Amino acid sequence: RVALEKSVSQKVAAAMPVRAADKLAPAQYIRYTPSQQGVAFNSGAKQR
């Protein structure tokens, strides 16, 4: 029921097309570990 109806909701909200545009979700924060490690890159931090 859950998965079914959520996909329903997206497909029918397509059939809304007049989208009652809701606000953009709050800014997310993502923590990123590059594969290439090296002190000369990222000014020497192993994360961004």
Binding site: Q28, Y29, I30, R31, S43, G44, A45, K46, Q47, R48
Partner: protein
């Protein structure tokens, strides 16, 4: 998917932007210490001062004009006051000019 606090990220970013050094963000499973990354010696000599934190700087601020009496018809520069140490025209000169003509012909 991190979730961090908001004043602090912008504080660190502006620090690294205008001062050139920053409290490195690596949250490692090996316990590293607070290390100023980037211009490390600049962080050392400047005492870690942030662009947001007030600090003593005798740096010569560029000279500007100030015409803020709004009754002069062509007087008010107000907030739009130009910098006094600014140029009045921007152009390339005789050698680079002919060289750029030569390049635009070569292209």
């Amino acid at each position: 998917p991190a979730h961090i606090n908001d004043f602090m990220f912008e504080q660190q970013r502006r620090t690294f932007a205008t001062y050139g050094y920053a409290l490195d963000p690596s949250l490692d499973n090996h316990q590293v210490s607070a290390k100023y990354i980037g211009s490390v010696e600049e962080a050392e000599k400047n005492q870690g001062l942030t662009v947001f934190e007030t600090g003593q700087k005798k740096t010569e601020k560029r000279k500007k004009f100030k015409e803020n009496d709004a009754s002069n018809i062509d007087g008010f520069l107000g907030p739009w006051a130009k910098y006094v140490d600014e140029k009045d025209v921007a152009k390339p000169s005789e050698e680079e000019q002919k060289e750029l003509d030569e390049i635009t012909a070569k292209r």
